[PDB]
Homo-oligomer: A and B are copies of this chain.
Amino acid sequence: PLYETLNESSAVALAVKLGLFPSTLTCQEIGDGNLNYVFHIYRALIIKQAVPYAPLTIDRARIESSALIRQGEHVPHLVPRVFYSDTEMAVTVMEDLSHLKIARKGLIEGENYPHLSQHIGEFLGKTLFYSSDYALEPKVKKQLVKQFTNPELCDITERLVFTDPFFDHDTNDFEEELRPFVEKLWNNDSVKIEAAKLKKSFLTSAETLIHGDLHTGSIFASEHETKVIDPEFAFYGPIGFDVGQFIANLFLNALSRDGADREPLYEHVNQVWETFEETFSEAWQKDSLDVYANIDGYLTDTLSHIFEEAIGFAGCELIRRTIGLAHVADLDTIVPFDKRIGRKRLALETGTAFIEKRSEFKTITDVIELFKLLVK
């Protein structure tokens, strides 16, 4: 069996064997998860390897490499370069981005990252367009669907984002002071029917190759640079999903802040939708293969559908990150405790509003303005 877990030594040996170094090197394992090692080798390099836990298939490393390379074809400046990949060893050798900070960390420290939304909006519009039926011959697209089928990672999302938070399930994790509001959600038939439909779309709508986990902890940032990483959840899913999960995580950071310190984030939500729409639209007009593409009003109705699902998926992400298994540092580190519970209540209520009202919003401004009203 060809798979063997690497260490700092064999990681160095792999790097030299690839001719990526002469080589005089030091290696430190710097990963923060329990299912991947990330080896930093210092010119520098990163080698990421999936571990079986021996649980989750090491096949996600094939998806991740393939996803990163595909993203690199259209937005090379917004993803790490890949130098080597191997499915059997479950390895991706890629560009070192140690000079950057994970965006969630920076944002909690109070960095504002002026270009974050412009860069992520571009990432969203080009990646989501160029792997769609709008951009690709349909027989080609259908092969990519097979190639990026991701049953085990999709299973995590289907459960965590779309199901468990809405019921009294074992995976949930919330303070007992939130229970009155949590049980309010559980008893809300109409929001749950809506969460069901959004889930159905997640299950069935193979529109493009999505990132599948595009939150602020999956992005590197500094003043001038942005890089998206860790596309292990990539599969063919709804266009609105990456847009919505990103947006929710900007709202999650706003909720961790107070007063006028929230404005940079509200500005990020506006600018990211704006940039997504502009970017998707330029691509659509330049590169669409569809005979229907140029019919007046078709791009518009298409964007309206993506906008609506995006808001619904943001609602689920807001709710999921508050009371489910996998939380965010933005909410969990708010102090004092009573203030934390207050803001977590607001994440629940705004997420609910987003799900229920998603088709009523006409612009991103309506979304921002409604959120601001609720969180006053």
Residues on A facing B (Cβ under 8 Å): 133, 138-139, 141-143, 145-146, 149, 151-152, 154-155, 158, 163, 167, 189-190, 192-193, 195-197, 199-200, 203-207, 290-292, 295-298, 301
Nearest-neighbour CB distance to chain B for A171, whole angstroms, equals 13
- Known: A189-B295, A193-B297, A197-B301; 18 extra A-B contacts, CB below 8 A, are A133-B204, A138-B154, A138-B158, A139-B151, A139-B152, A142-B149, A142-B151, A145-B145, A163-B291, A163-B292, A189-B297, A193-B295, A193-B298, A195-B292, A196-B290, A196-B298, A205-B205, A206-B206
Cα of A143 to Cα of B301 in the assembled complex, Å:
32
Cα of A146 to Cα of B149 in the assembled complex, Å:
8
Contacting pair B296 A199 (CB below 8 A): no
Cα of A298 to Cα of B197 in the assembled complex, Å:
9
> Which of B138, B146, B197 is the one whose CB lies under 8 Å from A155?
B138
Nearest-neighbour CB distance to chain B for A137, whole angstroms, equals 9
Cα of A122 to Cα of B89 in the assembled complex, Å:
49
> Which of B133, B139, B196 is the one whose CB lies under 8 Å from A292?
B196
Cα of A167 to Cα of B203 in the assembled complex, Å:
33
Q: Which chain B residues lie closer than 8 Å to A163 at the CB level?
A: 291-292
3 smallest A-B Cβ distances: which pairs?
A: A196-B292, A139-B151, A133-B203
The chain B residue with its CB closest to the CB of A139 is B151
Nearest-neighbour CB distance to chain B for A2, whole angstroms, equals 24
Nearest-neighbour CB distance to chain B for A251, whole angstroms, equals 25
Q: Which chain B residues lie closer than 8 Å to A152 at the CB level?
A: 139
Q: Which chain B residues lie closer than 8 Å to A207 at the CB level?
A: 204
Cα of A300 to Cα of B48 in the assembled complex, Å:
47
The chain B residue with its CB closest to the CB of A196 is B292
7 A-B pairs in the complex with CB atoms less than 8 angstroms apart: A133-B203, A133-B204, A139-B152, A142-B149, A146-B146, A189-B297, A204-B207
Cα of A206 to Cα of B200 in the assembled complex, Å:
10
Q: Which chain B residues lie closer than 8 Å to A139 at the CB level?
A: 151-152, 155
Contacting pair A301 B138 (CB below 8 A): no
Cα of A163 to Cα of B291 in the assembled complex, Å:
8
Q: Which chain B residues lie closer than 8 Å to A143 at the CB level?
A: 149, 151
